[PDB]
Amino acid sequence: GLSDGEWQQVLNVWGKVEADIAGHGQEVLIRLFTGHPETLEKFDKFKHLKTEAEMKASEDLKKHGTVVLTALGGILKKKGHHEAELKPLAQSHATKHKIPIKYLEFISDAIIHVLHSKHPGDFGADAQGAMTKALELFRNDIAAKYKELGFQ
Numbered sequence: 001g002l003s004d005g006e007w008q009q010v011l012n013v014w015g016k017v018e019a020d021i022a023g024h025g026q027e028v029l030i031r032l033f034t035g036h037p038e039t040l041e042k043f044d045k046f047k048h049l050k051t052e053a054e055m056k057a058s059e060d061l062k063k064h065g066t067v068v069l070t071a072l073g074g075i076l077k078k079k080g081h082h083e084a085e086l087k088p089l090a091q092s093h094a095t096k097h098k099i100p101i102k103y104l105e106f107i108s109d110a111i112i113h114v115l116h117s118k119h120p121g122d123f124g125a126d127a128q129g130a131m132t133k134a135l136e137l138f139r140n141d142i143a144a145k146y147k148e149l150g151f152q
Protein backbone atom coordinates (compact mmCIF):
# COMPACT_ATOMS: atom_id res chain seq x y z
CA GLY A 1 0.00 0.00 0.00
CA LEU A 2 1.47 3.28 -1.23
CA SER A 3 0.38 6.86 -0.67
CA ASP A 4 -0.25 9.25 -3.54
CA GLY A 5 3.09 10.93 -2.89
CA GLU A 6 4.86 7.58 -3.01
CA TRP A 7 3.23 6.66 -6.31
CA GLN A 8 4.30 10.07 -7.66
CA GLN A 9 7.90 9.21 -6.75
CA VAL A 10 7.62 5.80 -8.43
CA LEU A 11 6.32 7.27 -11.65
CA ASN A 12 8.94 10.01 -11.60
CA VAL A 13 11.70 7.40 -11.31
CA TRP A 14 10.03 5.40 -14.06
CA GLY A 15 10.48 8.34 -16.43
CA LYS A 16 14.21 7.69 -16.18
CA VAL A 17 13.62 4.11 -17.33
CA GLU A 18 11.30 5.08 -20.19
CA ALA A 19 13.96 7.35 -21.68
CA ASP A 20 16.07 4.23 -22.40
CA ILE A 21 13.95 1.16 -21.79
CA ALA A 22 16.23 -1.22 -23.70
CA GLY A 23 19.40 -0.09 -21.94
CA HIS A 24 17.78 -0.34 -18.52
CA GLY A 25 16.22 -3.70 -19.37
CA GLN A 26 19.53 -5.08 -20.65
CA GLU A 27 21.37 -4.04 -17.50
CA VAL A 28 18.67 -5.42 -15.20
CA LEU A 29 18.89 -8.86 -16.81
CA ILE A 30 22.70 -8.80 -16.88
CA ARG A 31 22.75 -7.93 -13.18
CA LEU A 32 20.34 -10.81 -12.50
CA PHE A 33 22.26 -13.35 -14.58
CA THR A 34 25.74 -12.45 -13.33
CA GLY A 35 24.74 -12.09 -9.67
CA HIS A 36 22.56 -15.22 -9.63
CA PRO A 37 23.74 -17.60 -12.37
CA GLU A 38 21.03 -20.14 -11.51
CA THR A 39 18.51 -17.69 -12.99
CA LEU A 40 20.07 -18.04 -16.45
CA GLU A 41 19.18 -21.74 -16.45
CA LYS A 42 15.48 -20.85 -16.55
CA PHE A 43 15.93 -19.21 -19.98
CA ASP A 44 16.41 -21.74 -22.75
CA LYS A 45 17.19 -18.87 -25.13
CA PHE A 46 19.92 -17.34 -22.94
CA LYS A 47 21.59 -20.38 -21.35
CA HIS A 48 24.14 -20.38 -24.20
CA LEU A 49 25.56 -17.10 -22.87
CA LYS A 50 28.76 -17.91 -20.99
CA THR A 51 30.39 -14.49 -20.56
CA GLU A 52 29.03 -11.07 -19.73
CA ALA A 53 30.51 -9.79 -23.00
CA GLU A 54 28.26 -12.22 -24.89
CA MET A 55 25.37 -11.03 -22.72
CA LYS A 56 26.16 -7.40 -23.56
CA ALA A 57 26.41 -8.20 -27.27
CA SER A 58 23.11 -10.13 -27.38
CA GLU A 59 20.40 -8.19 -29.18
CA ASP A 60 17.79 -10.75 -28.15
CA LEU A 61 18.63 -10.18 -24.48
CA LYS A 62 18.06 -6.45 -24.96
CA LYS A 63 14.79 -7.26 -26.73
CA HIS A 64 13.62 -9.39 -23.82
CA GLY A 65 14.67 -6.65 -21.41
CA THR A 66 12.30 -4.32 -23.26
CA VAL A 67 9.48 -6.86 -22.93
CA VAL A 68 10.08 -7.26 -19.18
CA LEU A 69 10.27 -3.57 -18.33
CA THR A 70 7.34 -2.71 -20.61
CA ALA A 71 5.22 -5.18 -18.67
CA LEU A 72 6.42 -3.89 -15.30
CA GLY A 73 5.85 -0.29 -16.33
CA GLY A 74 2.28 -1.06 -17.32
CA ILE A 75 1.71 -2.59 -13.88
CA LEU A 76 3.32 0.32 -12.01
CA LYS A 77 1.18 2.85 -13.88
CA LYS A 78 -1.93 1.20 -12.38
CA LYS A 79 -0.85 2.38 -8.90
CA GLY A 80 -1.76 -0.93 -7.28
CA HIS A 81 -4.97 -1.62 -9.22
CA HIS A 82 -3.18 -4.22 -11.29
CA GLU A 83 -5.11 -7.47 -10.77
CA ALA A 84 -5.86 -7.95 -14.48
CA GLU A 85 -2.29 -7.13 -15.55
CA LEU A 86 -0.63 -9.21 -12.84
CA LYS A 87 -2.70 -12.41 -13.02
CA PRO A 88 -1.38 -13.66 -16.42
CA LEU A 89 2.22 -12.96 -15.39
CA ALA A 90 1.82 -14.78 -12.08
CA GLN A 91 0.25 -17.70 -13.92
CA SER A 92 2.86 -17.92 -16.67
CA HIS A 93 5.77 -17.55 -14.26
CA ALA A 94 4.44 -20.19 -11.86
CA THR A 95 3.05 -22.75 -14.29
CA LYS A 96 5.07 -22.42 -17.50
CA HIS A 97 8.41 -20.86 -16.57
CA LYS A 98 8.54 -22.24 -12.99
CA ILE A 99 10.14 -19.14 -11.45
CA PRO A 100 10.42 -19.26 -7.64
CA ILE A 101 9.40 -16.11 -5.79
CA LYS A 102 13.02 -15.81 -4.62
CA TYR A 103 14.04 -14.95 -8.18
CA LEU A 104 11.48 -12.13 -8.19
CA GLU A 105 13.22 -10.82 -5.08
CA PHE A 106 16.54 -11.04 -6.95
CA ILE A 107 15.23 -9.04 -9.92
CA SER A 108 13.63 -6.45 -7.63
CA ASP A 109 16.95 -5.75 -5.94
CA ALA A 110 18.65 -5.73 -9.36
CA ILE A 111 16.35 -2.91 -10.48
CA ILE A 112 17.39 -0.83 -7.46
CA HIS A 113 21.05 -1.57 -8.19
CA VAL A 114 20.77 -0.55 -11.85
CA LEU A 115 18.98 2.70 -11.00
CA HIS A 116 21.84 3.75 -8.72
CA SER A 117 24.42 2.62 -11.28
CA LYS A 118 22.92 4.60 -14.18
CA HIS A 119 21.73 7.61 -12.15
CA PRO A 120 24.28 8.03 -9.34
CA GLY A 121 23.30 10.86 -7.04
CA ASP A 122 19.97 11.18 -8.86
CA PHE A 123 18.06 8.32 -7.15
CA GLY A 124 17.35 9.82 -3.75
CA ALA A 125 16.45 8.10 -0.52
CA ASP A 126 12.74 8.94 -0.86
CA ALA A 127 12.71 7.63 -4.43
CA GLN A 128 14.43 4.41 -3.37
CA GLY A 129 11.91 4.00 -0.57
CA ALA A 130 8.93 4.36 -2.89
CA MET A 131 10.34 2.15 -5.64
CA THR A 132 11.16 -0.56 -3.11
CA LYS A 133 7.62 -0.46 -1.72
CA ALA A 134 6.17 -0.71 -5.22
CA LEU A 135 8.30 -3.75 -6.06
CA GLU A 136 7.35 -5.32 -2.71
CA LEU A 137 3.66 -4.87 -3.54
CA PHE A 138 4.20 -6.43 -6.97
CA ARG A 139 6.04 -9.40 -5.43
CA ASN A 140 3.49 -9.81 -2.65
CA ASP A 141 0.54 -9.96 -5.03
CA ILE A 142 2.41 -12.50 -7.17
CA ALA A 143 3.12 -14.48 -3.99
CA ALA A 144 -0.59 -14.63 -3.22
CA LYS A 145 -1.26 -16.18 -6.64
CA TYR A 146 1.65 -18.59 -6.17
CA LYS A 147 0.10 -19.77 -2.90
CA GLU A 148 -3.28 -20.28 -4.55
CA LEU A 149 -1.53 -22.49 -7.13
CA GLY A 150 0.58 -24.33 -4.57
CA PHE A 151 3.73 -23.30 -6.40
CA GLN A 152 7.07 -23.21 -4.61
Ligand code: HEM
Binds near residue numbers: 067092107
Ligand atom coordinates in the same frame (compact mmCIF):
# COMPACT_ATOMS: atom_id res chain seq x y z
C1 HEM B 1 9.78 -7.76 -12.94
C2 HEM B 1 9.61 -9.08 -13.01
C3 HEM B 1 9.24 -9.81 -14.31
C4 HEM B 1 8.44 -9.41 -15.29
C5 HEM B 1 7.60 -8.11 -15.37
C6 HEM B 1 8.45 -10.42 -16.31
C7 HEM B 1 7.76 -10.37 -17.49
C8 HEM B 1 7.78 -11.32 -18.48
C9 HEM B 1 7.00 -11.28 -19.70
C10 HEM B 1 6.06 -10.12 -20.10
C11 HEM B 1 7.28 -12.39 -20.39
C12 HEM B 1 6.69 -12.82 -21.74
C13 HEM B 1 5.23 -13.29 -21.54
C14 HEM B 1 5.05 -14.43 -20.56
O1 HEM B 1 5.64 -15.52 -20.82
O2 HEM B 1 4.30 -14.27 -19.56
C15 HEM B 1 8.24 -13.17 -19.63
C16 HEM B 1 8.78 -14.39 -19.99
C17 HEM B 1 9.67 -15.11 -19.25
N1 HEM B 1 10.09 -14.81 -17.97
FE1 HEM B 1 9.71 -13.12 -16.95
N2 HEM B 1 9.29 -11.45 -15.92
C18 HEM B 1 9.80 -11.08 -14.69
C19 HEM B 1 10.68 -11.81 -13.93
C20 HEM B 1 11.23 -13.01 -14.31
C21 HEM B 1 12.30 -13.72 -13.63
C22 HEM B 1 12.99 -13.25 -12.33
C23 HEM B 1 12.56 -14.84 -14.32
C24 HEM B 1 13.60 -15.95 -14.09
C25 HEM B 1 14.66 -15.85 -13.28
C26 HEM B 1 11.69 -14.86 -15.47
C27 HEM B 1 11.65 -15.86 -16.41
C28 HEM B 1 10.98 -15.79 -17.60
C29 HEM B 1 11.10 -16.73 -18.69
C30 HEM B 1 12.01 -17.98 -18.68
C31 HEM B 1 10.32 -16.32 -19.68
C32 HEM B 1 10.15 -16.98 -21.07
C33 HEM B 1 11.26 -16.43 -21.97
C34 HEM B 1 11.22 -16.95 -23.39
O3 HEM B 1 11.71 -18.08 -23.63
O4 HEM B 1 10.72 -16.23 -24.28
N3 HEM B 1 10.88 -13.74 -15.43
N4 HEM B 1 8.52 -12.49 -18.46
